[PDB]
């Protein structure tokens, strides 16, 4: 039926990073196969986020399909596609209720795995992903549970703050640690106001980290309203990235 093989190292790095991110979003990495492209999507139980990774036909050297959605455990798949220390030369993934994946190192040692699978059914911002990755990864998910993205008509400022909560007598049950940064409009590649948006940080960190895994660099953000979900996207030669997260009301 479906069969795909990647011979390029950076493509395998992107595949591994994407798989790890979808595993960190939900324990099950939902995967469906289309002759045009292979798309991997995941839905957190809270239903407040949605990330999809698209692998086009040109991504794989031979993306043959002879027909399909099947649910695969995320942790099992993320430990298969990992790069061992000290060089995978061919990653063949195929299905003909067991998924078959064949891995061979440069030293010709060959491994096969048989994971189980389950068949199932405004404004525009374009900023450098490097500076965004800098600020984001510098933040810690432990202290920060809330992101404040605000754009001024002159500068763009992003901060990793925390929603404070007070108890019986102004009790500091949760603090407001706010790691902040300010960025001028020269760094921002394309801004179109045609604004305050509040959402999470961990998923944003993982999605941002997905991109630069290819050593071959911008992220486009369109949004509106507080009760409506924000769109999030990045584009690669054979890889297409999407994230949809519900913004704070």
């Amino acid at each position: 039926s479906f069969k795909a093989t990647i011979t390029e190292s950076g493509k395998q790095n992107i595949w591994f990073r994407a798989i790890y991110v979808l595993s960190t979003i939900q324990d099950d990495i939902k995967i469906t196969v289309t002759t045009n492209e292979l798309i991997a999507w995941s839905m957190n139980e809270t239903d407040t986020t949605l990330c999809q990774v698209r692998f086009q036909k040109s991504f794989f050297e031979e993306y043959e399909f002879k027909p399909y959605s099947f649910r695969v455990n995320g942790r099992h798949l993320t430990t298969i596609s990992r790069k061992p220390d000290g060089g995978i030369k061919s990653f063949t993934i195929a299905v003909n209720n067991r998924l078959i994946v064949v891995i061979e190192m440069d030293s010709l040692i060959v491994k096969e795995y048989c994971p189980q699978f389950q068949p199932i059914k405004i404004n525009y911002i374009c900023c450098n992903s490097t500076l965004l990755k800098n600020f984001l990864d510098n933040c810690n998910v432990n202290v920060t549970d809330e992101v404040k993205l605000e754009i001024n008509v002159h500068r763009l400022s992003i901060t990793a703050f925390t929603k404070a909560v007070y108890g019986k007598n102004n009790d500091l049950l949760r603090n407001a640690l706010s790691m902040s940064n300010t960025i001028s409009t020269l760094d921002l590649e394309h801004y179109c106001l045609f604004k305050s948006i509040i959402f999470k940080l961990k998923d944003f960190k993982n999605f941002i980290t997905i991109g630069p895994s290819w050593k071959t660099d911008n992220i486009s953000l369109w949004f509106c309203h507080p009760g409506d979900p924000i769109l999030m996207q990045m584009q690669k030669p054979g890889v297409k990235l999407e994230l949809v997260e519900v913004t704070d009301s």
């Binding site: 790890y20 595993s23 960190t24 979003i25 939900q26 324990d27 957190n44 139980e45 809270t46 239903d47 407040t48 986020t49 995320g74 942790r75 993320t78 549970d145 929603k163 404070a164 909560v165 007070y166 108890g167 019986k168 009790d171 049950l173 949760r174 959402f199 999470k200 961990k202 993982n206 309203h225 507080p226 009760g227 409506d228 519900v246 913004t247 704070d248 009301s249």
Partner: protein, 437 residues
């Protein structure tokens, strides 16, 4: 093909085996937390297993949430072992993502399966996070519904630390004093389904399975077995499972249902006043020990017997019987938790109350022992005595033993300081407060 309790799930709240008052008191509350600027932030439902809590929540969220949706239920999954995240952060992530369900999104939250609360760290994290939800400074939040199944944890490997979740899985032993006593918290304790609702619903299941029931000629007997099942259990799911097992069978298999645990005051009343349908004290006490040894093997049970043995005929019985009861309790206190001690004490109490029980008795109401009050008073006394001793060294060099503080210095020294106060030192009032009667 499918389980009877799964294919016969009620399609509407008219089909649910719940009391009329219970349905009204849950509907009014659920509407109360639904309106914007709601007073009740969260709702807590507690009760035994299979008392139709989740079912009524399903139907109420089915015909209530759509009314307030601007232009369903969301459950927590403890099995979600997500990558890169520690287990203790799963509920944190769930709550952080579930609070984004206010505007253009509305879904009542049902925490049906709690996180693992037997681990003290994540239990404390659960308490802190649900308190942060309760004390939240957010302008508004989606309604929170939490269902707790009250079940007794049976005995296991001898290592018990929490002392609350390790003897009983209830809302009191999970949630702390602050959480339950909160203006924005609503608690509706549930009761086992009565025999009338069970009989009616079992009849409905039978009249929907007449062909098979008529096929095996068991329809001429279904009424007696339905009455027996309704009397045996107050569990709708267990009753339907037992009925399905009886119907699908083709023999004379006895109808056996899960045994429900006996509460604290239930056990106290069974020890004091006996048990109906069991005129044998020996067999009743034996079954009480086999089934509820976790509850009976405690000092709190002997304290409860001592505190509540005077509720028999409003203390209107012979003093010889009371002396015998307290004598046996004191003797049992000298056996250090041996099973023979509890057995002998309960047997003697039951025998004493049986030899004096007749008709025309008007008993009182039992109460929980006041020992914890005495422990808190003793702790306050210890704090006050420590303060007095601390003041009694730097002000004037003198070391006094604690026994003397309890005996003489807790009364005479405050008296002297009060006389000194009138003809004029920090500690002027009596230690432990005044005594009365």
């Amino acid at each position: 093909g499918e389980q009877w309790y799964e294919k016969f799930k009620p399609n509407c709240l008219e089909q649910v085996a719940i009391h009329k008052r219970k349905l009204k008191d849950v509907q009014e509350a659920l509407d109360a937390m639904f309106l914007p600027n709601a007073k009740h932030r969260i709702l807590l439902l507690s009760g035994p297993s299979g008392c139709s809590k989740s079912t009524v929540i399903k139907e109420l969220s089915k015909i209530l949430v759509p009314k307030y949706r601007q232009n369903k239920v969301t459950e927590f999954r403890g099995d979600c072992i997500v990558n890169d995240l520690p287990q203790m952060e799963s509920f944190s992530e769930f709550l952080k993502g579930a609070r984004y369900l206010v505007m253009s999104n509305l879904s009542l939250i049902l925490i049906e399966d709690l996180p693992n609360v037997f681990h003290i760290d994540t239990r404390r994290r659960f308490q802190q996070l649900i308190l942060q939800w309760l004390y939240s400074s957010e302008p508004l939040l989606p309604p929170l519904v939490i269902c707790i199944t009250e079940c007794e944890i049976p005995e296991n490997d001898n290592n018990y630390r929490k002392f609350g979740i390790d003897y009983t899985f209830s809302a009191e032993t999970i949630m702390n004093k602050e959480i339950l006593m909160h203006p924005r918290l609503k608690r509706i304790k549930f009761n086992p389904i009565n025999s009338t609702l069970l009989k009616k619903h079992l009849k409905f299941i039978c009249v929907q399975n007449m062909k098979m029931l008529k096929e095996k000629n068991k329809w001429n007997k279904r009424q007696e077995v339905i009455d027996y099942i309704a009397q045996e259990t107050g569990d709708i799911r267990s009753a339907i499972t037992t009925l399905q097992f009886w119907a699908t069978s083709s023999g004379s298999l006895p109808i056996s249902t899960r045994e429900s645990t006996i509460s604290y005051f239930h056990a106290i009343g069974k020890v004091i006043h006996g048990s109906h349908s069991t005129n044998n004290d020996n067999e009743m006490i034996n079954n009480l020990f086999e089934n509820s040894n976790n509850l009976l093997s405690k000092e709190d049970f002997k304290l409860g017997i001592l505190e509540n043995y005077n509720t028999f005929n409003k203390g209107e019985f012979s003093i010889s019987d009371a002396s015998s009861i307290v004598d046996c309790l004191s003797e049992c206190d000298n056996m250090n938790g041996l099973p023979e001690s509890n057995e002998y004490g309960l047997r003697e109490v039951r025998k004493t109350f049986r030899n004096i029980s007749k008709q025309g008795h008007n008993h009182g109401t039992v109460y929980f022992p006041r020992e914890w009050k005495v422990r808190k008073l003793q702790n306050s006394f210890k704090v006050q005595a420590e303060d007095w001793l601390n003041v009694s060294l730097y002000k004037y060099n003198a070391v006094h033993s604690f026994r003397n503080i309890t005996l003489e210095f807790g009364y005479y020294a405050p008296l002297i300081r009060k006389c000194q106060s009138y003809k004029k030192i920090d500690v002027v009032d009596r230690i432990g407060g005044p005594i009365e009667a």
